[PDB]
Amino acid sequence: VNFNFNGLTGTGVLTESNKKFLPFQQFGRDIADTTDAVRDPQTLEILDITPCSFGGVSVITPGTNTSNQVAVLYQDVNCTEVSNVFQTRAGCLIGAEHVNNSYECDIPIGAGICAVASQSIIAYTMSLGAENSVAYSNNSIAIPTNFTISVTTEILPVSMTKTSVD
Amino acid sequence: CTMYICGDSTECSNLLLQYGSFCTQLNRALTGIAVEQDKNTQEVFAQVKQIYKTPPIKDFGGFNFSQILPDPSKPSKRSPIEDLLFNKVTLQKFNGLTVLPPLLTDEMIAQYTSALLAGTITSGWTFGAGPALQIPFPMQMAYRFNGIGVTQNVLYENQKLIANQFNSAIGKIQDSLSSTPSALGKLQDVVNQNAQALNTLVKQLSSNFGAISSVLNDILSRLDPPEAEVQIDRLITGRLQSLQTYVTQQLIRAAEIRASANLAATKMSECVLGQSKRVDFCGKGYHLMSFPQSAPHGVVFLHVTYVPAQEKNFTTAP
Amino acid sequence: KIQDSLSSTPSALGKLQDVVNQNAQALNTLVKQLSSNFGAISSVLNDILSRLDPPEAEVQIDRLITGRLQSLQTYVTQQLIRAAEIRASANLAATKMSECVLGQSKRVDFCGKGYHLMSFPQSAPHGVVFLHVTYVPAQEKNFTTAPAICHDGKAHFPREGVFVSNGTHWFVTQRNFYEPQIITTDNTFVSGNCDVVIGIVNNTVYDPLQPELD
Ligand SMILES: *[C@@H]1O[C@H](CO)[C@@H](O[C@@H]2O[C@H](CO)[C@@H](O)[C@H](O)[C@H]2NC(C)=O)[C@H](O)[C@H]1NC(C)=O
Ligand SMILES: *[C@@H]1O[C@H](CO)[C@@H](O[C@@H]2O[C@H](CO)[C@@H](O)[C@H](O)[C@H]2NC(C)=O)[C@H](O)[C@H]1NC(C)=O
Ligand SMILES: *[C@@H]1O[C@H](CO)[C@@H](O)[C@H](O)[C@H]1NC(C)=O
Ligand SMILES: *[C@@H]1O[C@H](CO)[C@@H](O)[C@H](O)[C@H]1NC(C)=O
Ligand SMILES: *[C@@H]1O[C@H](CO)[C@@H](O)[C@H](O)[C@H]1NC(C)=O
Ligand SMILES: *[C@@H]1O[C@H](CO)[C@@H](O)[C@H](O)[C@H]1NC(C)=O
Ligand SMILES: *[C@@H]1O[C@H](CO)[C@@H](O)[C@H](O)[C@H]1NC(C)=O
Ligand SMILES: *[C@@H]1O[C@H](CO)[C@@H](O)[C@H](O)[C@H]1NC(C)=O
């Protein structure tokens, strides 16, 4: 709601509170100099003001070279207010199906969840790698019997275009 | 940039729009920092292609790792030391500024440190170079002794003393971290600096910057547009300059954290994954082995080193 | 395989394409800022000079000056930070070139995954590509071990390698490649006795003098 309390105006959700205002104070502010609660007139009660939910909107897309299907992530609003909808600790992702089995992370979303496969966009908890255990004992050693020689490529930038502005 | 500088005002939004791309370049800078922070965590912790697991029987030749291995009885499978670190550093988003979660959660980071520690315990450095080859831990430590110019027979003849000294030093580590404050200052300072930067950025909203009033709605609601527009433009310019200062400071601080993260990843690779001959790179003394532990926004290395003790003078000849 | 890998896996050169893209994006926004008014009557400086008298054109020009100078300062600051990042990367590349191409590095994972053998430099636009040739151990075999061998009461330790058994016979082998050798006095050394080490098996150690004198 758009409120106006004795000249202090703003937008937010007004809710009941348990903050004991003293008889002479009319509104209270949090750290950082912003209003946390206010005392209503006519009825003398303490209302907490929490800004109504807002947040960035992110688009999950495989790419125009693969499919035109996209998923939408609402980062810090709940979506239980304004085709599958899955709530994650990073926000609620709509359009991606939640699959219980883990895979290697492809498109990072946040809070351990990443998200195209099997003709649709899926969302899942990222795997950290194959699970294995080493046969540890107090009298067993594994020694290789055959080298393989591998070549890896590591690419490092060294310079940038020497631009100049007059 | 739009909600922070101007907010819910279209009359104001139209003036913010005349500054071009400043808001898209500040969102670009902040997204760049946010992405590199996840790259930092991935490079420092995700150095193992597979998740290794320790055996259920802790027959490590007398070496006690119960203080660095995860505790299965705890709600988040943390080791005692890591639990102490999460309980020692202690850590606002209503004016259009939000904080995104990291890609790697604390549980997942702890699982990576558990994989690294189980790998180093059960296979030495072999899991870093290729496949994890099991080796008895006393034989592993005997080779690590051989790597610093002490013949492996010194460990085997003194195995009980070495195990007792290792266990005592590890036990001392928790008491030191729990009793000497400022020990975690390198992480408390970064958390404090980021909290202070956000608190200052929000506090700048109360400043006038020369305008008659800091709150846009009362000036817009009391002054006529042809004259209020100037006060709005002045406040927008001051607030935009404040945001630019915040972003620049964050870019420099991000570069500092990136350098530290690169150093941490190098230390993890050359101290935890292997054995370093680089003097004083992996703690004071001749390096034997290292143990990674996670911490809020950082990593703690337990460097186990060999230090010469009582010495005697002898006459020599080449 | 390297040629096919880089020719078939996109984003493989991402570390250089991202720097080129970041510089192009910064320069593109710097140019695009010329379309902004910053409150001036028009973004084209020449049209205001062609329509306004100096005493009033000066205020519009001063506003345009302030907006473009602060935009340029933002570009320069971001370029200084990006230059510091590229400089750090170039210093790392020079260190890698020296300690991987010019020598052989013993510091693990600094010159690729595996035990470093040698490296190859390759130039690339605004960057360098290193081909690291590394030794990677493969298929391992289990063996039973012991830290020392008791012979006639004396404790023998390997000078290099470890003692392994195939179940029935004990051999000495280097740790990084299975190559069983008979335990002798010339691959093993003596220190102490077996009654001190908690891990010991009783085997025989062959002294080449035994067959040379018989
Ligand atoms: C302000 O005036 C209103 C209306 O006169 C008061 O509301 C009344 O309060 C009495 C006492 O509690 C109740 O018995 C009535 O039923 C209330 N009427 C209504 C319509 O709510 C209100 O309490 C006054 N506030 C003050 C004096 O602080
Ligand atoms: C070590 O591995 C190499 C391959 O990595 C083996 O060479 C292969 O040998 C088989 C049978 O002799 C051939 O059919 C393959 O074509 C060979 N491949 C290559 C690339 O040469 C080699 O035999 C292995 N040695 C041991 C002792 O295991
Ligand atoms: C968001 O949704 C979840 C599940 O519906 C609920 O537990 C939580 O309280 C909600 N949070 C807010 C702020 O509405
Ligand atoms: C290791 O030490 C802890 C106490 O610090 C003890 O509870 C635990 O049983 C010990 N483990 C072994 C295997 O002795
Ligand atoms: C060694 O023995 C263990 C016994 O459980 C087995 O799991 C492991 O695969 C063996 N190693 C190899 C290289 O086969
Ligand atoms: C172990 O190796 C020796 C030497 O080749 C051989 O004589 C013996 O039969 C082998 N034993 C087993 C169980 O493989
Ligand atoms: C290896 O571990 C087993 C487990 O009980 C034990 O019985 C045996 O004595 C140990 N051997 C050595 C050499 O430590
Ligand atoms: C090795 O030999 C000694 C005497 O020669 C004996 O006392 C000892 O028990 C033997 N080792 C084992 C494991 O039985």
Swiss-Prot record, chain A:
Q: What is the effect of changing residue 76 to G?
A: Increase of pseudotyped VSV particle production ex vivo. Increase of viral load in hamster upper respiratory tract
From the record, give the cysteines joined by S-S bonds: 79-92, 105-114
Result of mutating residue 133 to L?
In strain: Omicron/BA.2.12.1
Sites carrying a glycan are 65, 78, 100, 138, 146
Q: Where in the cell is it found?
A: Virion membrane; Host endoplasmic reticulum-Golgi intermediate compartment membrane; Host cell membrane
Describe how it is modified after translation: The cytoplasmic Cys-rich domain is palmitoylated. Palmitoylated spike proteins drive the formation of localized ordered cholesterol and sphingo-lipid-rich lipid nanodomains in the early Golgi, where viral budding occurs. Specific enzymatic cleavages in vivo yield mature proteins. The precursor is processed into S1 and S2 by host furin or unknown proteases to yield the mature S1 and S2 proteins. Processing between S2 and S2' occurs either by host CTSL in endosomes, or by host TMPRSS2 at the cell surface. Both cleavages are necessary for the protein to be fusion competent. Cell surface activation allows the virus to enter the cell despite inhibition of the endosomal pathway by hydroxychloroquine. The polybasic furin cleavage site is absent in SARS-CoV S.
Reported biotechnological use: Main component of the anti-COVID vaccine Chadox1/AZD1222/AstraZeneca; in which the human tPA leader sequence is added in N-terminus to enhance protein secretion.
The record makes one more remark, namely: Variant D614G has become the most prevalent circulating sequence in the global pandemic since April 2020. The mutation is associated with higher viral loads produced in cell culture and animal models. It would not change pathogenicity nor neutralization properties vs vaccination. May be prevalent because the mutation increases virus transmission in human population.
Family, similarity comment: Belongs to the betacoronaviruses spike protein family.
Q: What is known of its domains?
A: Contains sequence and structural motifs very similar to those of a bacterial superantigen and can directly bind and activate T-cell receptors. Activation of a broad T-cell repertoire may be involved in the hyperinflammatory syndrome in acute COVID disease.
Output this protein's name: Spike glycoprotein
Question: Which species expresses this protein natively?
Answer: Severe acute respiratory syndrome coronavirus 2 (2019-nCoV)
Classification from the root reads: Viruses, Riboviria, Orthornavirae, Pisuviricota, Pisoniviricetes
The shown range, given as first to last of full length, is 539 to 737 of 1273
From Swiss-Prot, chain B:
Residues at site: Cleavage? 78-79
Q: What is the effect of changing residue 189 to N?
A: In strain: Delta/B.1.617.2, Mu/B.1.621
Region described as Heptad repeat 1 = 159-209
Q: Which residues form a coiled coil?
A: 188-232
Look up what happens after changing residue 266 to I: In strain: Gamma/P.1
- Top-level lineage group: Viruses
Official protein name in the record: Spike protein S2
User: Which species is this record about?
Assistant: Severe acute respiratory syndrome coronavirus 2 (2019-nCoV)
Range of the intact protein held here: 738 to 1079 of 1273
